[PDB]
């Protein structure tokens, strides 16, 4: 029963039909349309263009069109080095890849005059690099300039996450210049183009995959906040091993991990009634909305416990251990914040994820914290 | 303090602004503009004659002078002087001062290569040797035959990088040399604060007015105002999930039910119940996670009831209602 679901985990898209119109001159060897391909994240958009060019290169005339990933540069030189790697040649590399005018000499081909288009992968690392109008916008500016006179032009295909980048362009560039205009976006496929690809990615079909309307149910009730349904099939591939482990069932398993302690399991964290007392003690110190030290909390803990004698006053060292019991369940977090007297000195400020509405319910059942409120 | 504000203005998008701006700057006062340009054309032989005396020529005046300098330097002067000395004509090295990315090292590395490398000047390249290397250039040039070999142009000399003081003194030592003619323009009203009697001794500036009331097309690009957020988050909503449009629509209604300030906002509990009422929000976490996406792109605010409020104006939210949400 393994080998049917061993193969489970692994032209084709209805977005490739768009881009061949957008590359309408790429089979007639002319300069194509003006390509700035954006997208909200997770939407397949990195592999989307990679699907096109791999279908382009396997289809396509002299054949040399290269694509490089802009991740580890922070600087516009070695991209123009990596276009030279499809030549397998040798030259003086440093000057030719550095200046704007130095790129222009690089664009005279050798063997058969096939035009070249570059593909700039993950442009947002250089967009969201160092300060905008100094280097990175200038880097954006310099690449999109295609004023070259022969039709051999370095057509850009760049990609980005967040859609602020168009308004970042200068008003000269927004005057119908370069690869600007066609701001081709990709809205996140709800279930209406992505699930059908999963259907065709079920070409080798086992008998019991499961009831596919539940798969349709999975698609409809994941599409609130999602972009990657194969990865959201990779959460089905984990639950398909659950039915192997036991020889949207799992989204139900995963949300109760996150929703609880405020409604119900707050009292699970405080089986000690003193842990209930010390939890209200933190919030009474939160009146002075300050750097809530473990000492200022201990200050209000003593000066209240001398008034109402519910228990004896305990140690600060005990007060250290008891607040860590509050910590490991995930209620209150402790951080070493800032005080700048001698050096960067670290006093510990706490923060609570509970509200007084979710407090007042669980304390009226216990009239021993009622003196303390 | 009832003040009319730029937020309370009929705003204009990107393509609408720049096109009708391009209509005015190429059709408003066209006839008198070239009519000025023909009048000042007769001054061009006068500039040629004085510039043989090594005079740093400086152009002030209202309006952009960028087009005028490039006509005067490139087409008129630079072949006229090459013909009058007796072959490629005189090299023109412009300096775009409105471009803030001008440094002192890079432009001078061009200069010593533009000027003659007759000696091993890379030996004196050592750590600031720039004033050192130009001093060895100056005293050698005192005993050379007097002829211009280079004319440089510095547009917008009060620019964001050229007005820095270690760059200004660098240009001061260039101007005392007789072989190079220095034709620059500034635009500031406090431009003669830049020079003392030390530098102007090295400069021997003269002045001329040019006022053509040009629009400064290139010089407007780097500059920005609030035309260039209410407009920022106007584009993110155009690419999201369809549910975020609806949960912002229910957000924007009761936040405009009551400028858009804090007081018109809503509590988190009831808004969870309201977005539970239309079968949208499952709980607090599923609400907040796709509300952090409105938080991450700074599209909504929260202050303290637990009030979440939109920081856009009263007029803006109904514009966000009828256009992008609907």
């Amino acid at each position: 029963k393994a080998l049917l679901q061993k193969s489970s985990e692994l032209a084709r898209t209805a977005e490739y039909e768009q881009v061949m119109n957008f590359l309408a001159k790429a089979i007639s060897e002319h300069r194509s349309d003006s390509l700035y391909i954006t997208g909200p994240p997770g939407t397949g958009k990195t592999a989307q263009l990679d699907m096109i060019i791999r279908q382009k290169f396997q289809s396509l005339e002299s054949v040399a069109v290269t694509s490089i990933n802009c991740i580890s540069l922070g600087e516009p030189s070695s991209i123009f080095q990596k276009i030279f790697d499809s030549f397998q040649d040798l030259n003086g590399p440093t000057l030719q890849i550095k200046n704007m005018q130095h790129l222009q000499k690089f664009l005279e081909p050798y063997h058969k005059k096939t035009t070249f288009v570059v593909v700039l992968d993950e442009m947002d690392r250089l967009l969201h690099a160092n300060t905008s109008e100094t280097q990175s916008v200038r880097t954006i500016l310099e690449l999109f300039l295609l004023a070259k006179l022969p039709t051999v032009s370095f057509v850009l295909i760049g990609m980005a996450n967040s859609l602020d980048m168009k308004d970042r362009f200068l008003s000269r560039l927004n005057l119908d210049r370069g690869l600007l205009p066609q701001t081709i976006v990709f809205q996140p496929y709800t279930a209406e183009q992505m699930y059908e690809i999963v259907i065709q990615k079920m070409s080798s079909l086992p008998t019991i995959i499961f009831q596919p309307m539940a798969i349709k149910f999975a698609a409809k009730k994941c599409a609130g906040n999602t972009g990657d349904l194969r990865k959201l099939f990779d959460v089905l591939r984990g639950s398909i091993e659950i039915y192997e482990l036991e020889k949207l069932n799992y989204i139900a398993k995963v949300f109760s991990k996150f929703v609880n302690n405020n409604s119900t399991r707050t009292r699970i964290a405080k089986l000690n009634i003193q842990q209930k007392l010390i939890l209200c003690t933190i919030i009474q110190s939160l009146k002075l909305n300050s750097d809530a030290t473990i000492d200022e909390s201990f200050d209000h803990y003593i000066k209240a416990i001398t008034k109402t004698d519910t228990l004896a006053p305990l140690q600060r060292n005990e007060f250290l251990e008891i607040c860590t019991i509050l910590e490991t369940c995930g209620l209150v977090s402790i951080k070493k914040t800032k005080c700048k007297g001698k050096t960067k000195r670290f006093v510990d400020k706490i923060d609570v994820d509970l509200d007084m509405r979710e407090f007042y319910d669980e304390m009226t059942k216990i009239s021993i914290l009622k003196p303390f409120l | 303090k009832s003040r009319h504000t730029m937020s309370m203005a009929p705003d204009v998008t990107r393509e609408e602004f720049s096109l009708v701006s391009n209509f005015f700057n190429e059709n408003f006062q066209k006839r008198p503009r070239q009519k000025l340009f023909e009048i000042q054309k007769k001054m061009f032989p006068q500039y040629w004659f004085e510039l043989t005396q090594g005079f740093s020529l400086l152009f002030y005046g209202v309006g952009s002078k960028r087009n005028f300098l490039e006509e005067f330097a490139i087409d008129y002067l630079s072949p006229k002087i090459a013909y009058s000395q007796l072959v490629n004509s005189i090299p023109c090295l412009i300096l775009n001062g409105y471009n803030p990315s001008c440094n002192y090292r890079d432009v001078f590395k061009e200069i010593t290569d533009l000027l003659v490398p007759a000696e091993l000047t890379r030996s004196e390249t050592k750590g600031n040797h720039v004033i050192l290397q130009i001093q060895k250039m100056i005293d050698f040039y005192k005993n050379q035959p007097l002829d211009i070999k280079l004319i440089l142009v510095v547009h917008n000399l009060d620019g964001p990088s050229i007005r820095k003081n270690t760059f200004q003194t660098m240009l001061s030592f260039l101007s005392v040399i007789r072989q190079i003619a220095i034709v620059a323009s500034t635009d500031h009203i406090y431009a003669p604060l830049l020079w003392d009697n030390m530098k102007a001794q090295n400069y021997n500036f003269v002045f001329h007015d040019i006022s053509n009331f040009e629009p400064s097309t290139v010089e407007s690009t780097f500059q920005d105002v609030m035309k260039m957020g209410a407009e920022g988050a106007k584009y993110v909503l155009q690419s999201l999930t369809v549910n975020s449009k609806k949960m912002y629509k229910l957000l924007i209604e009761t936040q405009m039910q009551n400028r858009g300030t804090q007081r018109t906002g809503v509590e988190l509990k009831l808004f969870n119940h309201l977005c539970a009422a239309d079968f949208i929000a499952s709980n607090e976490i599923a609400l907040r996670s796709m509300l952090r996406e409105f938080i991450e792109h700074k599209m909504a605010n929260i202050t303290k009831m637990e009030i979440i409020w939109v920081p856009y104006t009263y007029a803006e939210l109904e514009k966000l209602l009828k256009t992008v949400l609907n």
């Binding site: 005018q101 | 023109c92 412009i94």
Partner: peptide, 27 residues
Amino acid sequence: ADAQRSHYTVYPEKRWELYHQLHSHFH
């Protein structure tokens, strides 16, 4: 077109002679 790139170089009298005998002599 190129004006946003900084510092791009490019490679494109009976009366006055009586001045010329006077000017340099003064200098």
